[PDB]
Amino acid sequence: TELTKCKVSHAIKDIDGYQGISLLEWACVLFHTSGYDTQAVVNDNGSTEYGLFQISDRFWCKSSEFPESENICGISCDKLLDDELDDDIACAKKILAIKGIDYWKAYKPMCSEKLEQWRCEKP
Amino acid sequence: LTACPEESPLLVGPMLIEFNIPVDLKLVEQQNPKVKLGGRYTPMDCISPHKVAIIIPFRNRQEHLKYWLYYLHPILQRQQLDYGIYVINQAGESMFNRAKLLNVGFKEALKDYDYNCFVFSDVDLIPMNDHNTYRCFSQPRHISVAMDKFGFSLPYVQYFGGVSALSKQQFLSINGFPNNYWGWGGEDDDIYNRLAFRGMSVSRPNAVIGKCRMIRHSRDKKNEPNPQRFDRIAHTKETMLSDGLNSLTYMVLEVQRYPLYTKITVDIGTPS
Numbered sequence A: 001t002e003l004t005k006c007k008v009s010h011a012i013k014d015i016d017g018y019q020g021i022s023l024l025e026w027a028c029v030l031f032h033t034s035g036y037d038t039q040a041v042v043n044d045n046g047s048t049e050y051g052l053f054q055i056s057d058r059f060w061c062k063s064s065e066f067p068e069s070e071n072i073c074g075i076s077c078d079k080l081l082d083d084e085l086d087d088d089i090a091c092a093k094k095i096l097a098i099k100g101i102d103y104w105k106a107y108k109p110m111c112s113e114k115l116e117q118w119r120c121e122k123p
Numbered sequence B: 001l002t003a004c005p006e007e008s009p010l011l012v013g014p015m016l017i018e019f020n021i022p023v024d025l026k027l028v029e030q031q032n033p034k035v036k037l038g039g040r041y042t043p044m045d046c047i048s049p050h051k052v053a054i055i056i057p058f059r060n061r062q063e064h065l066k067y068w069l070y071y072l073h074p075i076l077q078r079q080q081l082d083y084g085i086y087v088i089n090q091a092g093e094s095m096f097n098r099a100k101l102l103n104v105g106f107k108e109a110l111k112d113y114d115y116n117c118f119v120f121s122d123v124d125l126i127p128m129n130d131h132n133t134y135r136c137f138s139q140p141r142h143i144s145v146a147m148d149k150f151g152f153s154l155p156y157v158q159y160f161g162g163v164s165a166l167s168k169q170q171f172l173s174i175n176g177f178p179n180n181y182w183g184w185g186g187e188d189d190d191i192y193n194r195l196a197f198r199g200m201s202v203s204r205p206n207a208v209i210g211k212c213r214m215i216r217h218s219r220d221k222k223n224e225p226n227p228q229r230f231d232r233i234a235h236t237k238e239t240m241l242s243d244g245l246n247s248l249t250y251m252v253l254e255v256q257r258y259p260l261y262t263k264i265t266v267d268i269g270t271p272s
């Protein structure tokens, strides 16, 4: 499903400030990472990135295609393709804590400035 | 005989835009009797200072092109522009390369007329308010500002993809667009960094006048998300100097003049 900036924003409130990354930065990153599409699937270089956070099956989640990675997140990759964002968020945090924000390449180039635009005034 | 006025008296404002009905170019051709071979038109009532070449990057999307021509032609004529339509068909099986094809369009269009303004338009974006003039201004112009795909909103302030207009000066000032973006994503952002690095600022119509509809379509397996875009958009400052108009090479395999448009199939090579 294609979510809106505000929908995404309200769903991830608990990642706010985690590892230093604010809500505004995440809203930006996510826009440039999956276009808010909870079902985004991008496969290249022999690995597949899934969902809103584009979490890869190379290390993080278990996919039938690449059946035995470390599955650091402890979740089936198909779980990152529904509209229930809790596990996705739970996984992303592991990524932030282990690898950091640079996992998300959209971050440095598109989200280093003009952040105010990313804010969601909707309660 | 006298210069066309600032604002066209032919404008209607908001238009209903739908892709439910099938198009018949012959009908389209009929309805637009003033369009000459090649997709050219020149207001005969007044003189437009806007000599506009419209460039459409393209590959196996003839259906979109139909709607594009069906809606765009009546609008552009109403906006009183002296224009020309150019579809830059990419031959081959290499990933889509939008920016490059836009570069080809610029060069090829010039061979036809003394154009002073270039509008770069994806084949699937249609303007919903003829007040969003498809021409050039004192600064680079972003046109697909309120696309329905983005909730009739500007998704991000640095967004320049979709449909835009640069004057020859403006386009020439940034060494045109890059040639090394194969696949989806980033090139329109790279173009944005250029306009910025050259001291220009982006101009846009308000979110109401800039409403646009986009014909949705199944993902293109020949335009997969470019894995290198994240690194490439970070070096424009350096690369706009070596990759642009000055480094453009391509081979024209065919030039087709249809009554409503000029189609140029080219071989722009492979991801070098």
Ligand SMILES: CCCC(=O)N[C@@H]1[C@@H](O)[C@H](O)[C@@H](CO)O[C@H]1O
Pocket: A031, A032, A033, A035, A105, A106, A110, B161, B162, B184, B185, B186, B187, B188, B189, B229, B230, B233
């Ligand atoms: C991270 C930078 C590379 C990238 O993906 N840029 C894309 C643009 O090419 C695209 O026009 C817009 C709208 O879809 O979204 C951006 O995210």
Ligand SMILES: [Ca+2]
Pocket: A079, A080, A081, A082, A083, A084, A085, A086, A087, A088
């Ligand atoms: Ca989920």
